[PDB]
Design a protein around this ligand. Structure first.
Ligand SMILES: CN1CCN(CCCN2c3ccccc3Sc3ccc(C(F)(F)F)cc32)CC1
Ligand SMILES: CN1CCN(CCCN2c3ccccc3Sc3ccc(C(F)(F)F)cc32)CC1
Ligand SMILES: [Ca+2]
Ligand SMILES: [Ca+2]
Ligand SMILES: [Ca+2]
Ligand SMILES: [Ca+2]
Length: 144
């Protein structure tokens, strides 16, 4: 279930999309965030994504709508290729392992200021075999 810790974290992630801090994620914001992650959606793809999550239909995504999206547990088979694309934005050198430096670079791009203590802790929580890196298998589980 949702712990007060998970709720605080989803707020940090929300504020990454909410660049202006106005309390809503607009199509413009989603777009600049996706371009940081090497993606490039059209104005149409951005309206559809917002639509898939926008419950009240006001064209924007607030914390409630965001939290609901994040809270719903999605399983594999339902877009396995999407998870693979996500893995690739992190595994910059394509060697199969998300290193601590690769996670930090992705976060730097998103505007997140992270300390060495924070990058290792994110790695630690996803790392299963304890090699201090995240391979595709470990990455998949974190999602599901
Ligand atoms: C002062 N303020 C303190 C918190 N830090 C953010 C912490 C970074 N990070 C993280 C690191 C270790 C363990 C937990 C967390 S909470 C968190 C939440 C969302 C994200 C996300 F979105 F990337 F997934 C990144 C972080 C920012 C500065
Ligand atoms: C079940 N449970 C397993 C692991 N936890 C944490 C996964 C680590 N994770 C994380 C941790 C703290 C705050 C935010 C984030 S976002 C994030 C993104 C990249 C990775 C990276 F780079 F490793 F892929 C790991 C994390 C999430 C779900
Ligand atoms: Ca906003
Ligand atoms: Ca809304
Ligand atoms: Ca790598
Ligand atoms: Ca590992």
């Amino acid at each position: 279930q949702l712990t007060e810790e998970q709720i605080a974290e989803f707020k940090e992630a929300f504020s990454l999309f909410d660049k202006d801090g106005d309390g809503t994620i607009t199509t413009k914001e989603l777009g600049t965030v996706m371009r940081s992650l090497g993606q490039n959606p059209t104005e149409a793809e951005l309206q559809d994504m917002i639509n898939e999550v926008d419950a009240d239909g006001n064209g924007t995504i607030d914390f409630p709508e965001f939290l609901t999206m994040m809270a719903r547990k999605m399983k594999d088979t339902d877009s396995e290729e999407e998870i693979r694309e996500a893995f690739r934005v992190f595994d910059k050198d394509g060697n199969g392992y998300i290193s601590a430096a690769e996670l930090r670079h992705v976060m730097t791009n998103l505007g997140e200021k992270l300390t060495d203590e924070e990058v290792d802790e994110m790695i630690r929580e996803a790392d299963i075999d304890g090699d201090g890196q995240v391979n595709y298998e470990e990455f998949v589980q974190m999602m599901t």
